[PDB]
């Protein structure tokens, strides 16, 4: 089983290729990592396995879900350290994903009820819903388009949070630049209508992610930075007129950061749409992952719809070096050992993805 | 087995609940029903079974796939007549689906290379593609928003086409009001941005489908008219802000049409929404749990008459739908492509042939069309 062949991810010696994908779970009450997170990541940790945390706030403005952890305060750092220590005692490697939602927030999640910040003043459409703190669903408001200087302060929030993640003991960080959140609000020409130097051209639209990655590379080293994008996922109205060309532009800039710095990023991580969908429609079904992998010099993590079989095929055929798993890792704490043994996998319950119970739907999925 | 209890679809006594879902197959070269269509439908016909044809053009502007049949000319009527004959000879009931694609077309499919027509001037976005005549995937262009007063001319196209269909011997017609096509482009508030009497309110957005159904009911009789909608479908950018309320508003208008005509429609046919697409994201499923759970039954319970569910059904799922009361009839698409004798295979609980998507829309009169094997 090629999923259980070792992989050197820069300095990190992984014993298998099964990765915990980053998953918001909303158990970090009051934006403070709670003991339950320690239990949850401990359950999924394996010797030489790679974990990526749920998306984690870089600033007071970065949240658009309830009870999601931050790492922008010393208080947050201290509680994360207890979690990281427990993961490290099992021999796991763990990265903190740094998450700014940009316009995918709501006044209830913002200081002083200020407008969420974004590349644009355009709101997510009423297609989509935000999870409100009462468990109801709400409507995304109009964001405020941030100015040129402000963009550098947000870059600084990523830099300082990466330092905070090293202070907590994390092995590294991941830049959440996917799924229509703040970085993707700059990348996607369906969102970014700026007419300053961050908008228009492909090169301009990649400035923001290039600045973020470069700042965190300078702070903690490239080999402790992974970068996650999703050029073909249009979640939260995040469409690009040309996903292949946007993805290649990002890849070229990541390669260039590596060449300029003289170092290798931990990895590029790309989420794919589930192409099994729309099979029942007339035109719904009428190369990309692998083109991006081919163009990228370094470690590639694929994600989105993967199964044991699909993961095995991805590694064996060289589409990816590592395979991250989300929903199946929610319901299978011992996912790695089940994949190793080909044991049947527990079903997952969407209803408790985002609830606050520290046990139910969180740590009470059974082991083999 | 509840799938094989009989059912009175109004005028038509059916011997079982397994229905051939309408499926575009692009074998009707140059929009003429071909002899291949006769063999294909005859293969799937059973005594007392119901078939719905592939979407069929109502006018020169109504197509957005290659080699789909029309029924807007008497030459087409003559050729359909022969296909209907061989289906009737096997004791099946067959409806012709009247399909206008609206903006889901391309200049190559339009007379004189003109713009496709729609409720709006907004094109389907770049995330969707059209099948070109050569089998490449092309870009949906900018449509022309039809005038307030030309809407009645398209309504007339449905009327004349419905009369042609029954003239060919069809037991009736189904209005394709689903999947982002012309009717749905008036229905869905993600598409219909009109400022006239056909846009804005929910009432206004239902005007087009109401007038289409009332014209065909008036021409051919209510019990020969089926109506297909898909309030909750991700296809060709056909989003509505409130799918359950859109669906209920449409049902209400059909109930009203039935009360005024004094007779029930043949059925309401509803495509089940799918929820695979965004299950992998952070927020993609968030406003949709209640719709997944209950949209289909709620529409069914609201409608005075026969309900056909469609979308993802299997033998087990189809049995449950009927046993549970969620549907009266269950339509199958892709399993019917690959199993000419699907009804018998479902009856006997036999193995089912796999379907090959690569030959769904090719022009071959045999390969991937009539050469799937019987038991
Ligand atoms: C409940 C849930 C929470 C998620 N939270 C995040 C997140 O915080 N950051 C992120 O980049 N992706 C997030 N994702 C996407 C996953 O990291 C991953 O790409 C996806 O689950 C992989 O597809 P799979 O579930 O089929 O394995 C989340 C997905 C789910 C289902
Ligand atoms: C190749 C193909 C062609 C289709 N053409 C039509 C059509 O012309 N009219 C329509 O209303 N639905 C059409 N559909 C949707 C089907 O009628 C039906 O709703 C769907 O196939 C049911 O799901 P199933 O395939 O899982 O049984 C088509 C589906 C496919 C796969």
Author numbering:
A (entry chain A): 10 to 295, 303 to 384
B (entry chain B): 10 to 384
What's in the article?
Jasmonates are phytohormones that are pivotal in mediating plant responses to various biotic and abiotic stresses and regulating plant growth. The first crystal structure of OPR3 from tomato (SlOPR3) showed that the enzyme crystallized as a self-inhibitory dimer in which the L6 loop, a critical loop involved in substrate recognition and coenzyme binding, from each protomer intrudes into the active site cavity of the other protomer. Based on these observations, it was postulated that the formation of the self-inhibitory homodimer represents a mechanism for regulating OPR3 activity and, thereby, jasmonic acid biosynthesis.
The wild-type self-inhibitory and R283E homodimer differ mainly in their L6 conformations. The sulfate binding site of both homodimers superimposes well, but no sulfate ion is bound in the R283E-dimer structure, corroborating that the sulfate-mediated interactions are not required for dimer formation. The dimer interface in R283E seems less stable than that in the wild type because loop L6 of one protomer in R283E is highly flexible, as evidenced by the quality of the electron density map. So, substituting R283 for glutamic acid seems to destabilize loop L6 and thus the dimer. A precise comparison of the dimers suggests that the amino acid substitution disrupts interactions that stabilize the stretched conformation of L6. In the wild-type homodimer, R283 is involved in intramolecular salt bridges that—together with other salt bridges—seem to maintain the stretched conformation of both loops in the dimer (top). These R283-mediated salt bridges are missing in R283E. Instead, E283 forms a salt bridge with R343 in one protomer, which is located at the enzyme's active site entrance, thereby destabilizing the whole loop L6, as evidenced by missing electron density for large parts of the loop (bottom). However, in the second protomer, the stretched conformation of L6 is maintained, as a salt bridge between R294 and E301 and a strong H-bond between Y284 and E300 compensate for the missing R283-mediated salt bridge; E283 is not resolved in this protomer due to disorder. Considering both the DLS and crystallographic data, it seems that the amino acid substitution R283E increases the flexibility of loop L6 in the corresponding variant, impeding proper dimer formation.
